[PDB]
Design an enzyme around this catalytic site. Structure first.
Site, PDB file in Angstrom:
ATOM      1  N   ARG A   1      36.314  48.279  40.418  1.00  0.00           N
ATOM      2  CA  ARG A   1      36.034  47.246  39.426  1.00  0.00           C
ATOM      3  C   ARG A   1      37.278  46.903  38.616  1.00  0.00           C
ATOM      4  O   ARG A   1      37.502  45.735  38.276  1.00  0.00           O
ATOM      5  CB  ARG A   1      34.896  47.689  38.506  1.00  0.00           C
ATOM      6  CG  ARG A   1      33.513  47.461  39.094  1.00  0.00           C
ATOM      7  CD  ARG A   1      32.428  48.076  38.226  1.00  0.00           C
ATOM      8  NE  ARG A   1      31.107  47.911  38.818  1.00  0.00           N
ATOM      9  CZ  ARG A   1      30.441  48.875  39.441  1.00  0.00           C
ATOM     10  NH1 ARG A   1      30.944  50.092  39.566  1.00  0.00           N
ATOM     11  NH2 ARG A   1      29.243  48.610  39.952  1.00  0.00           N
TER      12      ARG A   1
HETATM   13  N1  LIG Z   1      35.318  35.304  38.874  1.00  0.00           N
HETATM   14  C1  LIG Z   1      36.166  36.330  38.622  1.00  0.00           C
HETATM   15  N2  LIG Z   1      37.421  36.108  38.175  1.00  0.00           N
HETATM   16  C2  LIG Z   1      38.271  37.120  37.923  1.00  0.00           C
HETATM   17  N3  LIG Z   1      37.962  38.418  38.084  1.00  0.00           N
HETATM   18  C3  LIG Z   1      36.737  38.786  38.526  1.00  0.00           C
HETATM   19  C4  LIG Z   1      35.748  37.737  38.823  1.00  0.00           C
HETATM   20  N4  LIG Z   1      34.635  38.365  39.242  1.00  0.00           N
HETATM   21  C5  LIG Z   1      34.887  39.699  39.213  1.00  0.00           C
HETATM   22  N5  LIG Z   1      36.138  39.949  38.784  1.00  0.00           N
HETATM   23  C6  LIG Z   1      36.734  41.297  38.633  1.00  0.00           C
HETATM   24  O1  LIG Z   1      35.938  42.228  39.367  1.00  0.00           O
HETATM   25  C7  LIG Z   1      35.485  43.300  38.539  1.00  0.00           C
HETATM   26  C8  LIG Z   1      33.978  43.453  38.689  1.00  0.00           C
HETATM   27  O2  LIG Z   1      33.450  44.090  37.530  1.00  0.00           O
HETATM   28  P1  LIG Z   1      31.889  43.974  37.153  1.00  0.00           P
HETATM   29  O3  LIG Z   1      31.435  42.552  37.379  1.00  0.00           O
HETATM   30  O4  LIG Z   1      31.711  44.581  35.783  1.00  0.00           O
HETATM   31  O5  LIG Z   1      31.145  44.934  38.212  1.00  0.00           O
HETATM   32  P2  LIG Z   1      30.289  44.342  39.444  1.00  0.00           P
HETATM   33  O6  LIG Z   1      31.261  43.492  40.224  1.00  0.00           O
HETATM   34  O7  LIG Z   1      29.820  45.575  40.178  1.00  0.00           O
HETATM   35  O8  LIG Z   1      29.182  43.563  38.775  1.00  0.00           O
HETATM   36  C9  LIG Z   1      35.864  42.969  37.104  1.00  0.00           C
HETATM   37  O9  LIG Z   1      36.650  44.027  36.548  1.00  0.00           O
HETATM   38  C10 LIG Z   1      36.678  41.694  37.167  1.00  0.00           C
HETATM   39  O10 LIG Z   1      37.999  41.932  36.671  1.00  0.00           O
HETATM   40 MG   LIG Z   2      28.291  45.239  36.089  1.00  0.00          MG
END
Ligand SMILES: Nc1ncnc2c1ncn2[C@@H]1O[C@H](COP(=O)(O)OP(=O)(O)O)[C@@H](O)[C@H]1O
Ligand SMILES: [Mg+2]
Ligand SMILES: Nc1ncnc2c1ncn2[C@@H]1O[C@H](COP(=O)(O)OP(=O)(O)O)[C@@H](O)[C@H]1O
Ligand SMILES: Nc1ncnc2c1ncn2[C@@H]1O[C@H](COP(=O)(O)OP(=O)(O)O)[C@@H](O)[C@H]1O
Ligand SMILES: [Mg+2]
Ligand SMILES: [Mg+2]
Lengths: 52, 473, 505, 472
Positions: free
Chosen positions: C370
């Site tokens: 993540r």
């Molecule tokens: N649209 C996006 N733009 C930039 N970074 C993203 C995007 N989507 C996800 N990320 C990165 O991927 C990681 C996913 O974290 P999170 O969403 O909290 O967990 P999950 O993907 O399991 O829901 C984040 O730390 C973020 O930095």
């Molecule tokens: Mg999450």
């Protein structure tokens, strides 16, 4: 040329037979997968009503 | 009136048993506040054990529990602060702000558990919500007051998608929003709050528009199980008294049902309904039914569903699949290709995606784009196994347009600048539909596919086309 | 029935109706299987340390009105029914400080290495709450584990909880040890900001395995900055359950002092099993797969302690590396799903890739980070983006590689690049590679320079390339290590070096 | 004044005794009851309270009445130890199973002792030339370490144990102790007769092996504690005598099975899939009491009976992590014709290092694992897609893997009547050289059946020549 055509027609037929084998194997093994994953639910049911 | 108090008799982990006096026995789902040296701890009753004893779940760390301590009842469930003052402040399930910025002098204080709206109050939502994301504004439009589901696994970008939704809605709509952090990680929580501060939605010295109901997983299971209903209480208080459309954001409904089964495991709660939780149906319906488009206002519930390795056999993801009306699945494979939003164009369906609701032009554009992308992944296998030259010219045009559209799906997020560095693009639904129709019409087929990648409108498309032309030569 | 019988059971079996002052003392009514039931101890706290007459310590988990449930810190032989018990007046703690480095300690902090006593700057509570939501900082400092695949596609940053989930004998502890060995590059320096102190937990682990691990650490001179918290399966279940929390407090000592610490939660499934045994013996209501109730809460309380503190708190970081053992690769069980949902990252070591010789066999298709490129070297991020893209393409085209039919030229090129990269990410045990070394091979692979080289000779290509870079283009490696960013001139020089090397093979 | 108690409850193998005094015997104490047919020993398990404790019956509770006199020894169960136990059958209570008189042991050490500390852990990577191709190739056995023989029912676990005994114990030189934990008495009799014939057991002279039998006919307590008794014998041989102990624990899974046995009637809440909650801890002390110390070494050779061939079962799964060398005897290879059945993938040992077995050995092992893994991955491809519908390189790798799997078969001297071929032995260097030559493709033209039931590459070429001559 006709031998190539017949060879690739038989290739299509053999890969269709392999596709049918994959399909029915997948059907029966997905029934088995559902049975096993439901058996996990039965096992968790029995150990919860015995332990608790 | 004399405060109602008793003595603790048993504490089994997060479960605490308290003994009360005659006619002093409170009701279930109440608050049993015990003065602890490490701040303040309150317990919520789950069942009566008889002999003037109540079985409760700790709402805060069970360190220092001694049998015989004086636990005073609050006369009901622990009231959480509700009002405009709660905006911009993280509030836990116990009502004690963890931002060390002063107590929330809320207008009122409502209990977590309340009667759901009656059957007559229930109604369907058929209004488009502007979320500022092209792909989900066109293919799977959100419903104002409906229940939205943000499916996706790990590393797919659910929570960041939720916070981007809050930011875009706050920028494009003055209605307040609430984000309940059920099962929310502390590092992810700090990231969420830093993003909220930097995006302008949370203004410490002024007016904010989002309130966090963070769950803080390291608190006992009861806190994780009840932060969802705490945020739901915030949402209904905002909807009813203020009479405005509000945005309920569930951090992870899977974590909510996991915590419900967990707190069932602590107590007796012999699992019968689904297998891991017998109550799950009861409290699950109590939660979901409370988000309803009442005559006072509308609450849009955008819940994120986490599927571990596509565990659809388990009833928990299917239960969430039953509640929602429009899905926004965020399959990881799309993000692995470069489209980091990761929402699947063909698997993210919308109930209100019809010419009668979203519009004839909007529905036609969405359907044509979906068909083009479906043909894309349908012919991708033969292209990979055979090649591109033998493919028919009409299918060649369709696959090229589908590639361009797929690049167009990725959009800069105003909340993602700390990782990407590209300023966010807050697009409009009408602009999205017009741009997608223009691209699909073939007017921009000569433009390279990289131009549509990581941009906003069609003007941004041609801008990136010029930039990449300059970079290449 | 004029007089029905409705009684069930009562913990009181001896009618005394007198005697008092048992608030601080008590008598053991029942004891067995490493747990004891004691009547009395009215003013005792939850899981407060309690001293027995025989000398064996205890923990007060169950506090039912009839008696207080005590779990014993060892065998139950020395404790008998009716023995006098006394409160210690305090919770369990563990010695913490900089003197723990270079020593092997018991779960209670006792030095089991046998090389003298233990010197600690202070004592900290074993059960310390996780740092608050506000005093946290975004994970931006990378943790250089040393293996190319984990560093590139699933990077770990300081204060990031990354789970190494894998099947038995897949190399999870091998990956952890390789990270510890890689940390010696900065642990032998002077800047404490780049210094990454390491602590290891051994719960449910063999004492012989712990001895082999510490011997391997000593062989590479990595044991000096490593702390081995060993709770062997021979020791009591409460000791195994308490070891991870004591080591978490040890790491939190470094975190709160401004230093950077790396904690690896090896065999968290063993801790879960020990807690399950403790709860089942204590007659606590069992849950899913007979596991105890507050097990997810246990894991969250243990893992959320490790994080990156804010600048006002000293800017310390505690990096968590939980390790669990799946049963036949089933990640859908209680403990696997819980730990995956808790930790930010899940490093997937599946035995199928290990049997294919990927070694450490990181399943990039299922592995998730993540934090991602946020806590990664900028040059490493640049190469790793293309690396992840190419591995994703190879994974979605890998089926035709097995088929080996007449494929498209572009698809054949992508398959060749993907297989060459998979052979490239393969490393050897206890052979860490720094970013200055790692980045050139990733850049060469993503640029198509490895297409000409045969798959069987990828390892020889790698070894000869590090030799050539350490001999001729040493300034490039020094610039990569120091600056950490590949500039345009640096990229051009690196591409020229790769072209020359591939010309010379 | 000896400690005297009265029996209150008898529930199968669980006996409850109350003592009319404050002097309550400690846990694991030996409680002897004078039965008309002899002496029954009870081991204290839990202190139930009210001056009553729960015990485990070492012998069948035949004619056990409530109120029968019970005498407490004062310490745990003590068995005879020393050179006297060599060549003698040892029961769980220490009484001589054999009818060759009593045992004149100088000391009687208790069966419940603390495991060696972390300081006294003398780990080593010494090789062990067992003489079996697959184990010497893929999971080399460690001298002084812990040895696993995981396998299902009817997979050759006992046969493998007997073959290992024949191969090593004759040339071991140091002392050894065979421990039968919950196994068939007929197999124990066959093993005893075989080692008497081979000279390992010398009734009229010196014997290099001490026999402890807790056979599967015995009550659950006896099955649980015979592992402890044999472990105590091995520990005394390692520490006091300072000799390399070749501990051969047979069916160690029976220890956990008996733990679950007694746990159900002890009031313990059942763990996952019905096992005892304390399985991990008790097996932890039992197994950690086996280790290589400075005084000597105990080379424990354990066979684990996996229930239903399900490696995810908690007891074998945790035994996997609590053991150095693993040898999985999969049924899918046992019925395939290679009855050695050592699955070439999950059978892993910590000796698989370039600095331990050599770079050439490591490369050979990695390559054979690669070939066999390609075979397993393409199993379905051969099955229904078609073997001929495959690439040349993949087909060659599949053929090489099949030849290797056939070569993994090795006749056993103890299984001469079973396989019908004399049990020849192969040295580690010979196996490494033969497999390296095979991987190079020097024997591709040779049919797969030539590698069947052969030893070295000389046996392979001899079988190929004989089949060519007989088939023409
Ligand atoms: N649209 C996006 N733009 C930039 N970074 C993203 C995007 N989507 C996800 N990320 C990165 O991927 C990681 C996913 O974290 P999170 O969403 O909290 O967990 P999950 O993907 O399991 O829901 C984040 O730390 C973020 O930095
Ligand atoms: Mg999450
Ligand atoms: N890079 C590598 N090269 C070769 N073997 C490796 C590598 N990494 C791990 N291994 C293998 O993995 C094994 C370690 O597995 P381990 O993590 O101890 O599993 P468990 O913790 O379940 O016992 C070692 O035996 C080693 O042979
Ligand atoms: N090398 C061999 N050749 C032929 N048969 C064998 C060989 N090894 C073992 N067997 C057969 O396998 C059986 C051994 O089963 P085993 O795995 O010992 O069962 P258990 O583990 O339940 O004792 C014997 O009956 C024998 O016939
Ligand atoms: Mg390990
Ligand atoms: Mg057997």
């Amino acid at each position: 040329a006709q031998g190539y055509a017949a060879e690739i027609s038989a290739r299509r037929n053999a890969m269709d037979n392999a596709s049918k084998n994959a399909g029915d194997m997948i059907n029966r093994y997905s029934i088995l997968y559902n049975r096993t994953r439901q058996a996990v639910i039965t096992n968790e049911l029995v150990d919860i009503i015995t332990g608790a | 009136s004399t405060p109602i108090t008793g003595k603790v008799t048993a504490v089994i982990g997060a479960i605490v048993d308290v003994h009360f006096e005659q006619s002093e026995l409170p009701a279930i789902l109440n608050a049993l506040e015990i003065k602890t040296p490490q701040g303040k701890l309150v317990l919520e009753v789950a069942q009566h054990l008889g002999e003037n004893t109540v079985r409760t779940i700790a709402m805060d760390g069970t360190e220092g529990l001694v049998r015989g301590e004086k636990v005073l009842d609050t006369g009901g469930p622990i009231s959480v602060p509700v009002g405009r003052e709660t905006l911009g402040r993280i509030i836990n399930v116990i009502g004690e702000p963890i931002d060390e910025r002063g107590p929330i002098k809320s207008k009122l204080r409502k209990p977590i558990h309340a009667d759901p709206p009656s059957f007559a109050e229930q109604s369907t939502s058929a209004e488009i919500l502007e979320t500022g994301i092209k792909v989900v504004d066109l293919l799977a439009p959100y419903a104002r007051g409906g229940k939205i589901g943000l499916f996706g696994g790990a590393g797919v970008g659910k929570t960041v998608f939720i916070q981007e939704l809050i930011n875009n809605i706050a920028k494009a709509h003055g209605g307040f929003s609430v984000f309940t952090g059920v099962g929310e990680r502390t590092r992810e929580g700090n990231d969420l709050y830093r993003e909220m501060k930097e995006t302008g939605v949370i203004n410490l010295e002024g007016e904010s528009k989002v309130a966090l109901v963070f769950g803080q997983m390291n608190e006992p299971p009861g806190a994780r199980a009840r932060v969802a209903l705490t945020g739901l209480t915030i949402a209904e208080y905002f909807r009813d008294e203020e009479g405005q459309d509000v945005l309920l954001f569930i951090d992870n409904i899977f974590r909510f049902t996991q915590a419900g089964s967990e707190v069932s495991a602590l107590l007796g709660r012999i699992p019968s309904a689904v297998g891991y939780q017998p109550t799950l149906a009861t409290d699950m319906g109590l939660l979901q039914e409370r988000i309803t488009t009442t005559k006072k206002g509308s609450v849009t519930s955008v819940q994120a569903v986490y599927v571990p390795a596509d565990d659809l056999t388990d009833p928990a993801p299917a239960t969430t699949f039953a509640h929602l009306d429009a899905t926004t699945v965020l399959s990881r494979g799309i993000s692995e290709l470069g489209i980091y939003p990761a929402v699947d164009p063909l698997d993210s369906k919308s109930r209100l995606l019809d010419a009668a609701v979203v519009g004839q032009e909007h529905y036609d554009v969405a359907s044509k784009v979906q068909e083009t992308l479906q043909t894309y992944k349908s012919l991708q296998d033969i292209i990979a196994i055979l090649g591109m030259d033998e493919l028919s010219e009409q299918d060649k045009l369709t696959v090229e347009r589908a590639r361009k559209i797929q690049r167009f799906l990725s959009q800069p997020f105003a909340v993602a600048e700390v990782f990407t560095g590209i300023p966010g693009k807050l697009v409009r639904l009408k602009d999205t539909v017009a741009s997608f129709k223009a691209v699909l019409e073939g007017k921009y087929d000569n433009i390279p596919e990289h131009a549509f990648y990581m941009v906003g409108g069609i003007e941004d498309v041609v801008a990136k086309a010029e930039k990449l032309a300059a970079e290449a030569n | 029935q004029p007089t029905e019988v409705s009684s069930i059971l009562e913990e009181r079996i001896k009618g005394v109706s007198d005697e008092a002052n048992l608030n601080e003392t008590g008598r053991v009514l029942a004891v067995g299987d490493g747990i004891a039931r004691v009547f009395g101890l009215n003013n005792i706290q939850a899981e407060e340390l309690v001293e027995f007459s025989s000398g064996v310590k205890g923990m007060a988990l169950n506090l039912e009105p009839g008696q207080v449930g005590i779990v014993l810190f060892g065998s139950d032989r020395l404790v008998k029914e009716g023995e006098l018990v006394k409160r210690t007046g305090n919770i369990v703690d563990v010695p913490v400080g900089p003197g723990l480095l270079g020593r092997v300690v018991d779960a209670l902090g006792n030095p089991i290495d046998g090389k003298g006593p233990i010197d600690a700057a202070g004592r900290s509570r074993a059960q310390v709450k996780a740092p608050g939501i506000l005093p946290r900082r975004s994970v931006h400092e990378p943790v250089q584990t040393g293996l190319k695949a984990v560093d590139a596609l699933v990077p770990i940053g300081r204060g990031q909880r990354e789970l190494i989930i894998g099947d038995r004998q897949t190399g999870k502890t091998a990956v952890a040890l390789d990270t510890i060995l890689n940390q010696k590059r900065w642990n032998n320096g002077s800047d404490e900001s780049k210094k990454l102190y390491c602590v290891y937990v051994a719960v449910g682990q063999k004492r012989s395995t712990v001895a082999q691990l510490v011997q391997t650490l000593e062989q590479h001179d990595a044991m000096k900055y490593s702390i081995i918290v060993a709770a062997t399966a021979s020791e009591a279940a409460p000791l195994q359950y308490l070891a991870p929390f004591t080591a978490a407090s040890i790491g939190e000592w470094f975190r709160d002092n401004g230093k950077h610490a790396l904690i690896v939660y090896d065999d968290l499934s063993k801790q879960a099993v020990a807690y399950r045994q403790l709860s089942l013996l204590l007659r606590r209501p069992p849950g899913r797969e007979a596991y105890p109730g507050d097990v997810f809460y246990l894991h969250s309380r243990l893992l959320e302690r490790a994080a990156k503190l804010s600048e006002k708190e000293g800017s310390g970081s505690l990096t968590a590396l939980p390790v669990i053992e799946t049963q036949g690769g089933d990640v859908s069980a209680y403990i696997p799903t819980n730990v995956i949902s808790i930790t930010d990252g899940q490093i997937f070591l599946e035995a199928e890739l290990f049997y294919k010789g990927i070694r450490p066999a990181i399943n990039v298709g299922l592995s998730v980070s993540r934090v991602g490129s946020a806590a990664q070297v900028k040059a490493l991020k640049q190469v790793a983006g293309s690396l992840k893209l190419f591995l994703a393409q190879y994974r979605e085209v890998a089926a035709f590689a097995q088929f080996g039919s007449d494929l498209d030229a572009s698809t054949k090129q992508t398959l060749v690049r993907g297989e060459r990269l998979t052979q490239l990410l393969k490393q050897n045990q206890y052979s860490p590679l720094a970013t200055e070394e790692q980045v050139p091979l990733i850049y060469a692979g993503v640029n198509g320079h490895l297409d000409g080289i045969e798959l069987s000779r990828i390892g020889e290509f790698e070894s000869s390339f590090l030799s050539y870079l350490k001999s001729n283009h040493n300034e490039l490696l020094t610039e990569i290590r120091e600056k950490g960013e590949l500039s345009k001139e640096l990229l051009a020089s690196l591409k020229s070096a790769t072209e020359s090397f591939v010309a010379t093979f």
